[PDB]
């Protein structure tokens, strides 16, 4: 068809404009970047020019930014069987999230400037109840994964960067006095729904790219439609990153809270469930080696599936490290009485044969060095 395929000038004007628009947005508008998030928070954080009366009572009526959090708190505390998607909550949560970070022998005297500015930016949010709003939304998603809970976890990380001490204090206090079970019920449900490596789906994808499908109005070469393996790879990453940030800074009080909740009616051991998920990832990474054990070289999509699975495994190990550092004797006993050892021996078996196979050539120097930092 290529040599007989009609040139561009022969296309009708309306048809040509139709795919012209989608190409223009994909190449010029999506690529364009607009930095307005910080200026939005700056505008919403000023409760100015209404203080002409300066009343003694000083009830401290909420500033515009505080009104967002209060409105998003009530829509999450209201009683609904299913929590629906709000495009406005998507936008404002993402704006709040990416309005916080804003980021070779740099010295520590100017290094502390960015940190104390970041702490100021997080203080701008958590001083208005945003920490509890995040807690409510997580306990309100009922274990149903989606863009809503992903945006909520994104905001919780952006407000918890560097392990904010007072933020962890507020989150722990709000859980301790509310004594609600649904928060950890959701955390367990979301984590249990996290996807693992799938050989059958990988083989199906390999056949799909072998066929190499094309559309009608033109042609896309080796189409990059959504991969059915590690589709929620970033969601599994930042869920454990959020859990790690909650225990970061050796918050022993919260560390014992994860292992057991004395105030709560029922106890859900997040640490044990975390080990169970790591076990499932261990099996999936083991059989994905065993697929390539007979083979000699690792292809392009294969090594990408290693890279993203290993990055998730790294995040899991960092979260486990933060669970037990301090040291936390309760967690140490829980790990001892868990199935962690089976994952440890299985990973060691995997690591041996990855290092031996991948060292035979210089084409997997990356996948070796990202391997090496994982153990």
């Amino acid at each position: 068809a290529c040599f007989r395929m009609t040139p561009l000038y022969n296309l009708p004007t309306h048809r040509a404009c139709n795919m012209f628009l989608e190409s223009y947005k994909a190449a010029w508008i999506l690529t364009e970047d607009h930095s307005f998030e910080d200026r939005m928070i700056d505008d919403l954080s000023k409760a100015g020019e209404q203080e002409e009366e300066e009343e003694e009572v000083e009830e401290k009526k909420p500033d515009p930014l505080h009104q967002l959090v209060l409105h998003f708190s009530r829509t999450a505390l209201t009683e609904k069987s299913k929590l629906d998607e709000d495009y406005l909550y998507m936008a404002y949560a993402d704006i709040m999230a990416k309005s916080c970070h804003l980021e070779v022998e740099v010295s520590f005297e100017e290094k502390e400037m960015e940190k104390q500015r970041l702490l100021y930016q997080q203080s701008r949010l958590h001083t208005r109840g945003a920490a509890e709003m995040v807690l409510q939304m997580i306990s309100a998603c009922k274990g149903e994964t989606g863009a809503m809970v992903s945006s909520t976890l994104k905001l919780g990380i952006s407000i918890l960067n560097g392990g904010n001490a007072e933020v962890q204090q507020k989150m722990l206090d709000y859980l301790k006095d509310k004594k609600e079970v649904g928060f950890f019920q959701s955390i367990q449900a979301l984590m249990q729904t996290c996807s693992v490596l799938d050989l059958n789906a990988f083989e199906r994808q390999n056949k799909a790219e072998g066929l190499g499908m094309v559309n009608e109005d033109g042609t896309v070469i080796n189409r990059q439609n959504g991969e059915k393996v590690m589709a929620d790879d970033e969601f599994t990453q930042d869920l454990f990153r959020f859990l790690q940030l909650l225990c970061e800074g050796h918050n022993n009080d919260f560390q014992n809270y994860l292992r057991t909740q004395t105030g709560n009616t029922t106890t859900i051991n997040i640490i044990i469930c975390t080990v169970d998920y790591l076990l499932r990832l261990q099996e999936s990474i083991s059989d994905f080696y065993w697929y390539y054990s007979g083979k000699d070289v690792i292809e392009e999509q294969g090594k990408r599936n290693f890279s993203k699975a290993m990055s998730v495994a790294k995040q899991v190990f960092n979260s486990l490290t933060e669970y037990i550092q301090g040291p936390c004797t309760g967690n140490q006993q829980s790990l001892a009485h868990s199935r962690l050892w089976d994952a440890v021996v299985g990973f060691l078996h995997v690591f041996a044969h990855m290092m031996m196979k991948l060292a035979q050539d210089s084409s997997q120097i990356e996948l070796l060095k990202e391997l090496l930092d994982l153990q």
Partner: protein, 820 residues
């Protein structure tokens, strides 16, 4: 008594206010037939006078305003409002005149922003339809569910908009007077009902350009000066009317977004033409480049040997300036594009003193002012204002979320698109109303109009962008969910929708992936649709799978195991509708089974080749549950397939057990044939699940195992006996008439073709002795039969053509294969 007396008679006022609420309720949600009836009780003169009656009480005034809106404006406003979310921009000279900024001389980057809602909009929106309210006209001879749907009652709109502008001016000036006697009894009762009318007329587009100019002067005079009278924004209004203020602004902001989209379409119109001309000239230069070039021309002609989708992507790929070498566009066109990007982002206010000087700055300043002045207590008002604030800041994001619904159309097909938009209007309006026969006829006519509209094939991308497949899916979901325990009421429009979705999938592959995301939902909904006969939703599921390899074959194992569990139930229980029609009781449903088996046939066999991943999985699911195969081959108690085919022949040929015994029903179930077709489908399905020949020689362990499994389940000898089983041959007799059998109640060549496919794929013919063994027992009488029936009379008969297709599709290639 005087109506104004109700300001003291609180007992009567509350009741009559509720009466007006009831008048809105009966005419609510497009009940235009009742709305015409209410014109008798409350007329145009009363409603128009009641608008201007300044001494009317609060609830009565608001009730009368909202009643006027409900009777005359709500249906048109609702349908037009839904139509505003899509931007179908035709290519017309008036579209070509659309620009981001009015022609001015302020600055090279951008000029002052044009007045919102002022100008021309070429976006396609259906015109409103109104029927004047008359009661002296004769009662129509047409009955219910056949007569055309009533339109909204008419009312003078130019007079209504002028009265609204005059009244709003009176209210605004009275607001500035700080009077102690507000109209209706409060500021809220003075401003909320009139602003609802203003918002509704603005949405309907009744107001003209000058009318919009007057409104902008009233809302904010000094900012909106094109080049006491205090604007609305300085009137320290209560919370309730602030919501209507936001509703006005999100309309003006919508108008600005539409103006931007139209400008993009106009720029696309010009840019495509000049880019095509440049590409044509470059192609002509390439035609003479072979004199002064060599084999490196492949990189220059890569554009013309590559499809246009990435041609434009390469041509447009010069934004970051690090890729200018690849792009062959001249710098004048490159300047044209980057200039239009510059004023486009300037129009969105990216980059380029208390005066806002624009709607974008004014809305943000006002909303922030409202929030910081007091603690807003209305959650809806909070969500309303922050929707506006987000839209003002995220100028590009809203454009990025509006471009996927944008589309351009040919000027010669505008009336056809105008018609399909009108037809889609009823379709959208019927999802908010309980299903009825009257609505059923209207939607069936609407669907047929979509069929007869040629644009439905010309532009599938637009048809996908409108998302009709979604709406037609939920209008089914209402029916399936409604009464799923008892019976699926009104199947007439259900089969019409299924026929539409099935006809929709075959349009293109992208239309097939749109349905592909909705299988497990649809298959789940097909659990109760088995009682209904015709175009079942299962056929929609199959139609989303046929003739597609990479996309359509990603069905999950959970889907397959749940479908085969349905097959197990159908092979375990009789059809309830069959039992209800007096049919003799047999412990399994053949029609339901054969319906599942043709779906599983399409699930595993695509483009003449079996699918390895689907084949073993489905065969494993059937082999776990022996009841799926039916009463035959169950194990112990499962008779041979020759016994099953024989008893199916006797049941079909002998009445009083083949049917009700009391096709006349046009889908008259014949049990013996249905059982026989079930077994034929089962053999056909296994044959299509057979491992491929090229895989057999590779020595694959599971491919060999699966082939041995099918050979062990289905013995070859019974298949030979089925081939040797005779046909019902049409004869010549009974005054020379065409003595022909009943197709759906007699033995057919199609079931024999299903036998042949299993033969040529599972067992195969490898030696002469077994070749000629089958040839002289079953093939020779049939092939002679087709030639004998090939005469001056019977050659055109349905049985003869059945033999012709049967031999030429499956039988004849098998002997052609085994010719050596």
């Amino acid at each position: 008594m005087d109506i104004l007396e109700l300001s003291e008679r609180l007992d009567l006022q509350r009741f009559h206010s509720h009466t007006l609420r009831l008048y809105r309720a009966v005419c609510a949600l497009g009940n235009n037939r009742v709305a015409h009836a209410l014109c008798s009780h409350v007329d145009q003169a009363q409603l128009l006078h009641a608008l201007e009656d300044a001494h009317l009480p609060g609830p009565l005034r608001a009730g009368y305003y909202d009643l006027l809106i409900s009777i005359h404006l709500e249906s048109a406003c609702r349908s037009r409002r839904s139509m505003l979310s899509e931007y179908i921009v035709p290519l017309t000279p008036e579209t070509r005149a659309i620009t981001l900024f009015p022609p001015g001389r302020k600055g090279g980057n951008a000029r002052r922003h044009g007045l919102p809602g002022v100008g021309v909009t070429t976006s396609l929106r259906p015109p409103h339809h109104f029927s004047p309210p008359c009661f002296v006209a004769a009662l129509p001879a047409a009955g219910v569910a056949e007569a055309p749907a009533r339109l909204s009652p008419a009312i003078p709109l130019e007079a209504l908009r002028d009265k609204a502008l005059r009244m709003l001016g009176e209210a605004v000036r009275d607001g500035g007077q700080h009077a102690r006697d507000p109209v209706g009894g409060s500021v809220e009762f003075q401003f909320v009902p009139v602003l609802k009318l203003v918002s509704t007329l603005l949405v309907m587009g009744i107001f003209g350009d000058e009318d919009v100019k007057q409104i902008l002067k009233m809302i904010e005079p000094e900012v909106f000066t094109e080049e006491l009278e205090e604007g609305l924004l300085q009137m320290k209004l209560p919370e309730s009317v602030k919501l209507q203020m936001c509703n006005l602004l999100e309309y003006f902001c919508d108008q600005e977004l539409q103006h931007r989209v139209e400008s993009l379409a106009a720029f696309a119109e010009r840019y495509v033409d000049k880019l095509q001309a440049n590409q044509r000239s470059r192609y002509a230069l390439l035609m003479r480049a072979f004199t002064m070039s060599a084999a490196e021309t492949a990189r220059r002609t890569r554009e013309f040997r590559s499809p246009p989708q990435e041609q434009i992507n390469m041509l447009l790929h010069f934004k970051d300036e690090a890729d200018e070498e690849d792009c062959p566009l001249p710098e004048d066109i490159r300047q044209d594009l980057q200039d239009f990007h510059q004023d486009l982002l300037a129009h969105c206010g990216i980059q380029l003193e208390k005066k806002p000087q624009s709607l974008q700055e004014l809305v943000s300043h006002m909303v922030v002012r409202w929030a910081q002045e007091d603690y807003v207590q209305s959650p809806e008002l909070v969500r309303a204002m922050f929707s506006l604030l987000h839209r003002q800041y995220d100028g590009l994001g809203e454009l990025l979320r509006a471009l996927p619904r944008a589309y351009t159309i040919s000027p010669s097909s505008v009336e056809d698109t105008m018609s399909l938009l009108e037809c889609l209007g009823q379709i959208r309006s019927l999802l908010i109303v309980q299903m009825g026969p009257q609505e059923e006829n209207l939607m069936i006519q609407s669907i047929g109009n979509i069929m007869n509209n040629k644009v439905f094939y010309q532009h599938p991308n637009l048809m996908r962008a409108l998302g009709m497949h979604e709406t037609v899916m939920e209008v089914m979901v209402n029916v399936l969910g409604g009464g799923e325990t008892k019976e699926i009421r009104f199947p007439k429009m259900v089969t019409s929708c299924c026929r539409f979705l099935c006809y929709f999938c075959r349009i293109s592959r992208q239309n097939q992936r749109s349905m592909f995301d909705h299988l497990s939902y649809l298959l789940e909904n097909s659990g109760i649709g088995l009682g209904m006969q015709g175009s079942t939703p299962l056929d929609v599921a199959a139609a989303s799978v046929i003739d597609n390899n990479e996309l359509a074959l990603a069905l999950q194992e959970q889907d397959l195991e749940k479908v085969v569990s349905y097959l197990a139930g159908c092979g375990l229980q009789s059809c309830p509708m069959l039992l209800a029609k007096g049919y003799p009781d047999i412990g399994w449903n053949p029609c339901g089974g054969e319906r599942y088996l043709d779906f599983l046939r399409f699930a595993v066999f695509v483009n003449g080749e079996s699918v390895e991943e689907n084949a073993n999985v489905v065969v494993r699911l059937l082999i776990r549950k022996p009841e799926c195969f039916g009463p035959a081959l169950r194990g112990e108690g499962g008779s041979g397939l020759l016994a099953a085919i024989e008893e199916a022949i006797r049941i079909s040929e002998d009445p009083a057990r083949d049917g009700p015994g009391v096709p006349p029903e046009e889908n008259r179930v014949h049990l013996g044939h249905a059982i026989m077709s079930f077994y034929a489908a089962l053999i056909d399905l296994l044959g299509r699940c057979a491992p491929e020949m090229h895989l057999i020689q590779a020595g694959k362990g599971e491919a060999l195992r699966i082939r041995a499994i099918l050979r062990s389940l289905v013995p070859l000898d019974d298949l030979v006996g089925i081939i040797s089983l005779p046909l019902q041959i049409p004869t010549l007799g009974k005054d020379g008439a065409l003595v022909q059998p009943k197709m759906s109640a007699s033995f057919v060549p199609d079931h024999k073709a299903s036998m042949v496919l299993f033969l040529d794929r599972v067992y195969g013919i490898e030696n002469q002795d077994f070749l000629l063994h089958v040839l002289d027992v079953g093939f020779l009488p049939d092939m002679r039969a087709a030639a004998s029936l090939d005469t001056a009379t019977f050659s055109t008969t349905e049985m003869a053509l059945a033999l012709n297709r049967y031999l030429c599709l499956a039988v004849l290639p098998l002997i052609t294969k085994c010719a050596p």
